[PDB]
């Protein structure tokens, strides 16, 4: 039954490798999203501070 | 009924490496099992 055990472990290892590589791909994607959102929040801050400037003026 | 050699199973065992260290230690004390080399073409540096 060892040859079957081998086949089962290889399938489990295949899935594990896929799951981890997928997590790394996700990490890269989330990082890009993080930058895009950060920039949008920065613009929101810019808008608000510009409004504060106008009020002060 | 004549005396003959004992039956042998040429059997394979899979287990986790942490468990493997302990098991080898304990199976070794048992002294009733003989392990075969599964990597005959691998030297001691390669065995790690």
Curated annotation (Swiss-Prot), chain B:
Domain of life per record: Eukaryota
Subcellular location(s) of the protein: Cytoplasmic vesicle, Clathrin-coated vesicle membrane; Cytoplasmic vesicle, Secretory vesicle, Synaptic vesicle membrane; Melanosome
Coiled coil: none
Subunit structure: V-ATPase is a heteromultimeric enzyme made up of two complexes: the ATP-hydrolytic V1 complex and the proton translocation V0 complex. The V1 complex consists of three catalytic AB heterodimers that form a heterohexamer, three peripheral stalks each consisting of EG heterodimers, one central rotor including subunits D and F, and the regulatory subunits C and H. The proton translocation complex V0 consists of the proton transport subunit a, a ring of proteolipid subunits c9c'', rotary subunit d, subunits e and f, and the accessory subunits ATP6AP1/Ac45 and ATP6AP2/PRR. Interacts with SPAAR.
Similarity comment: family membership: Belongs to the V-ATPase 116 kDa subunit family.
Function: Subunit of the V0 complex of vacuolar(H+)-ATPase (V-ATPase), a multisubunit enzyme composed of a peripheral complex (V1) that hydrolyzes ATP and a membrane integral complex (V0) that translocates protons. V-ATPase is responsible for the acidification of various organelles, such as lysosomes, endosomes, the trans-Golgi network, and secretory granules, including synaptic vesicles. In certain cell types, can be exported to the plasma membrane, where it is involved in the acidification of the extracellular environment. Required for assembly and activity of the vacuolar ATPase.
Protein name as it appears in the record: V-type proton ATPase 116 kDa subunit a 1
Organism expressing this protein natively: Rattus norvegicus (Rat)
Shown part of the complete sequence: 3 to 50 of 838
